[PDB]
Amino acid sequence: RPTFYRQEKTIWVPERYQNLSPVGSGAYSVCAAFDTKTGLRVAVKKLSRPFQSIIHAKRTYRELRLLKHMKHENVIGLLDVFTPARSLEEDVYLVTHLMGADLNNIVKCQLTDDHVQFLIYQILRGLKYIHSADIIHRDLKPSNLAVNEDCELKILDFGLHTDDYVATRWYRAPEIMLNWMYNQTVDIWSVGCIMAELLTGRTLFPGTDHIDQLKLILRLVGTPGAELLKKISSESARNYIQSLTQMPKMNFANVFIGANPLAVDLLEKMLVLDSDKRITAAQALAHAYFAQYHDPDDEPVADPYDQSFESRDLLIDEWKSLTYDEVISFVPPP
């Protein structure tokens, strides 16, 4: 209905979006643009080959459904959806509020302890909302976090993985890195890595590989207790852990020198090896380190999310009809 235009290392689309500049030509690409109607700077994601197989058609539908159901200040909020193709029988695009820049190029600059408080509070306030819809992030690296000059923070994901530029394994939880089991606390492990890297300014677990990563993590959190060893669903990995020369639990006070006491304490809470023992997003919000901004009423919980469709593995063709239904019925926010 609106007028579309074309331009190219990929081709792009309505008239309202101008000044297209590239961002990420990842495996599945993205553009940063300016929406003339709202007057905001927007991020425009284009899904390449969304229907070449039912698997990334499932990804397509999953993405749109989720982004539609996502409405949180600290989480990406869908703005527009459109296609130039001329009928339901016929590329697709996603638009969202574009924050200043990710967190990579800002770890290198400026941080005070209160800035870390505000940042990690935004992240945990987003993760409460995410986990209360029974959704797990997994890929919670700094480059998937959006920030602007006002230190506002929006959570995000365009991994767009298996790495073995900031390597992803450095922030992946031990158990999800070795399929030992997992509950949502893997994201909290990532948060611990991130807060530590901010306060200390350097990588916490700069693992060169799976093995080196694991060894670095243990050199801090120590070897597992007799209990946690039971929790492993891998007898080869079990014998390997039991073989590693035991490592005692280091005192985080020794490591996080000159760090806010409450900061070191929360780090103690967010880096428990046992998945069923780490602190939860809400329990961390309740932490005194965030009592400056901690507001239980200003930390809403996402309404239920109907994920029933995952078991519905449909034909190659008909899934685009349901994706089209979810496209046309989109409702922009005033």
Ligand SMILES: Cc1ccc(-n2nc(C(C)(C)C)cc2NC(=O)NCc2cc(F)ccc2Oc2ccc3c(cnn3CCO)c2)cc1
């Ligand atoms: C199979 C599958 C599909 C999707 C997801 N999934 N899950 C999540 C959550 C939050 C729930 C974890 C988010 C997503 N998907 C995206 O976040 N897609 C990016 C995207 C979406 C648009 F609607 C519009 C533009 C987009 O690209 C961007 C977005 C932010 C940007 C830029 C540039 N700057 N910034 C800000 C700072 O960098 C570009 C998971 C699995």
